[PDB]
From a paper:
GapR (growth-associated A/T-binding protein involved in regulation) is a chromosome structure protein conserved in α-proteobacteria, and it is discovered initially as an essential nucleoid-associated protein for normal growth and cell division in Caulobacter crescentus (1–3). Depletion of GapR gene in Caulobacter cells results in severe defects in cell growth, cell division, cell size, DNA replication, chromosome segregation/condensation and gene expression. Our current studies clearly demonstrate that free GapR is a tetramer, but not a dimer. Taken all together, there exist both major conformation and minor conformation for free GapR in solution, which are in dynamic exchange equilibrium with each other.
Interestingly, during our crystallization of GapR/10A sample, we also got a crystal which produced a dimeric structure of the Caulobacter GapR protein only, without the detection of any diffraction from DNA. A comparison of this GapR dimer structure with that of the dimer-unit from the open tetramer complex revealed that the backbone heavy atom RMSD for residues 16–65 is 0.32 Å, while residues 66–89 show larger deviations for both protomers. SAXS analysis results indicated that the experimental Rg value of the free Caulobacter GapR in solution is 28.6 Å, much larger than the calculated Rg (22.8 Å) based on this GapR dimer structure. Comparison of the calculated scattering curves from the GapR dimer structure and the experimental SAXS data of the free GapR shows a fitting χ2 value of 21.9, indicating the solution structure of free GapR can not be like this dimer structure. Analysis of the GapR dimer structure, it is apparent that the hydrophobic areas (residues 78–87) on the second α-helices are fully exposed, while the same hydrophobic areas in the closed tetramer participate in the formation of the tetrameric interface. It is possible that the dimer structure can not stably exist alone due to hydrophobic aggregation, when the C-terminal hydrophobic areas are fully exposed due to the disruption of the tetrameric interfaces for GapRΔC3, GapRD68A and GapRY82A mutants. }{}$$\begin{equation*}\ R{{\rm g}_{{\rm app}}} = \sqrt {\left( {{C_{\rm A}}Rg_{\rm A}^2 + {C_{\rm B}}Rg_{\rm B}^2} \right)/\left( {{C_{\rm A}} + {C_{\rm B}}} \right)} \end{equation*}$$\end{document} where CA and CB are the mass concentration of the major and minor conformers with radii of gyration of RgA and RgB, respectively. If the minor conformer is a dimer, then its radius gyration RgB (22.8 Å) is even smaller than RgA (26.9 Å) of the major conformer (closed tetramer), which can only result in a Rgapp that is smaller than RgA based on the above equation. Taken together, the possibility can be ruled out for the closed tetramer to dissociate into dimer in free GapR.
Numbering used by the authors:
A (entry chain A), B (entry chain A): 11 to 87
Write the structure that this text describes.
């Protein structure tokens, strides 16, 4: 059995996660809409998605290079 | 070569998709934070996630039952 406080906690957890998952689905739908718009303008959607992935990978690489920089500087001092 | 209007279109597409993908990542992080909070309260996160999936499946089932209802009613009229 779950006591009163725990039942409240559970209900709050489910409520918040479900609201966030609705927002996430809304965002995903908007991304789909932007790509559909692009397709309408004559763009290649598969290639656009690849452009986005490549740029994401570049940003990730730069962040890890910042981490590595802090590691080296730390080690040197 | 891409003409002026097409270059503007491309830049707008990438800009909007990347902003939306940042929002999506923010939402995913918030979901993680809610589950971390739940774990702190003594809840089983794996089981919570399963609760959320089950409820999502129930909602999906109800939507498809509404679709099927419209199909049957349509066919009958």
């Amino acid at each position: 059995v779950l006591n009163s406080t725990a039942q409240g906690q559970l209900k709050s957890i489910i409520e918040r996660v479900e609201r966030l998952e609705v927002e996430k689905a809304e965002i995903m739908e908007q991304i789909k809409e932007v790509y559909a718009e692009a397709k309408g303008n004559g763009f290649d959607v598969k290639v656009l998605k690849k452009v986005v992935r490549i740029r994401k990978q570049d940003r990730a690489k730069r962040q890890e290079e910042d981490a590595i920089l802090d590691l080296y500087l730390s080690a040197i001092g």
